[PDB]
Ligand binder design. Structure first.
Ligand SMILES: *CCC(=O)Nc1cc(Nc2ncc(Cl)c(Nc3ccc4ccccc4c3)n2)c(OC)cc1N(C)CCN(C)C
Length: 286
């Protein structure tokens, strides 16, 4: 492989301010990163034992090694006690909560554009030989309603397959459930489930079915149902992401092309009723 010359930035605790809690259950805070002597305020998210410190530094390693407009930005780490992961603040939350809270106001243009942007981010990760292993609507953050990015690389592995603990069964490819193989094509399966989440405005996949039953359901040939707004063109793409033969599933490069074609005439492919001073974003602080 090539030498990973990415830079790991160490940030002083004295450079962070206005810290409020965004969510917990670790904890994630919202705040402002003010680099000393820079006249710049960066809206940031701050994610917070030896085992906890090892895993958070693994995610810091991954996020420092990726740079793409549709992959979340790592700004640095802070070595205060428990290691803190400092990333770009995405002020509209995760896509899962966003489609649930704004169902009655999301048109076909936004849905298909999100599918394009997620596929662009995953295609970049594939270029970097990175398998996400946890692609889901909850792990796609919203910078603006027109710009989303993939997040949460706690399970990501650099690669061929990966052989592996606890995992999101209802988003995993069948070969990942049965024999624990993870590939870029197993990520494609998760992409199909993620699209199904968006097209259903936040429904839970296999709602009410225990995770221990998912592998037997998938082996029988059963899949997630066709969402009401989805034409057969869109649902066919999702079904192709859920093929048994991993090499028969679409490639991320191909998902970009197909969803971009659809985004040029979105109402032909999604049928939705009523469809007709010194603050600097991290994307501009290079
Ligand atoms: C799906 C939950 C969620 O993402 N909520 C959220 C997120 C942000 N913005 C943001 N920006 C960057 C990063 Cl790294 C994060 N990280 C994060 C991960 C997991 C998580 C779980 C629960 C709550 C927050 C959270 C954050 N997040 C944001 O910016 C304003 C707001 C929200 N909220 C408040 C959605 C509502 N909340 C889930 C109750």
């Amino acid at each position: 492989e090539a030498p990973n010359q990415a830079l790991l930035r160490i940030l002083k605790e004295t450079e962070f301010k206005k810290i409020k809690v965004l969510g917990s259950g670790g904890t994630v805070y919202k705040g402002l990163w003010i680099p000393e002597g820079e006249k710049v305020k960066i809206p940031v998210a701050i994610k917070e034992s030896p085992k906890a410190n090892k895993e958070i530094l693994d995610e810091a390693y991954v996020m420092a090694s990726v740079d793409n407009p549709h992959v979340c930005r790592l700004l640095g780490i802070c070595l205060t006690s428990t290691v803190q992961l400092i990333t770009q603040l995405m002020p509209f939350g995760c896509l899962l909560d966003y489609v649930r809270e704004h169902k009655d106001n999301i048109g076909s243009q936004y849905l298909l554009n999100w599918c394009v942007q997620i596929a662009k981010g995953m295609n970049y990760l594939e270029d970097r030989r990175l398998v996400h292993r946890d692609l889901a609507a909850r792990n796609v953050l919203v910078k603006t309603p027109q710009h989303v990015k993939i997040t949460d690389f706690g399970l990501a592995k650099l690669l061929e397959y990966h052989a592996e603990g606890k995992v999101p069964i209802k988003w995993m490819a069948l070969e990942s459930i049965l024999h624990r193989i993870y590939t870029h094509q197993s990520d494609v399966w998760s992409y199909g489930v993620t699209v199904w989440e968006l097209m259903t405005f936040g429904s839970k996949p296999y709602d009410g079915i225990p995770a221990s039953e998912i592998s037997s359901i998938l082996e029988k040939g059963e899949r997630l149902p066709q969402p009401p707004i989805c034409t057969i063109d869109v649902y066919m793409i999702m079904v192709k992401c859920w093929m048994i033969d991993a090499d028969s599933r679409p490639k991320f490069r191909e998902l970009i092309i197909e969803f971009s074609k659809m985004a040029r005439d979105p109402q032909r492919y999604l049928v939705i009723q009523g469809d007709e001073d010194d603050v600097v974003d991290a994307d501009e602080y290079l």
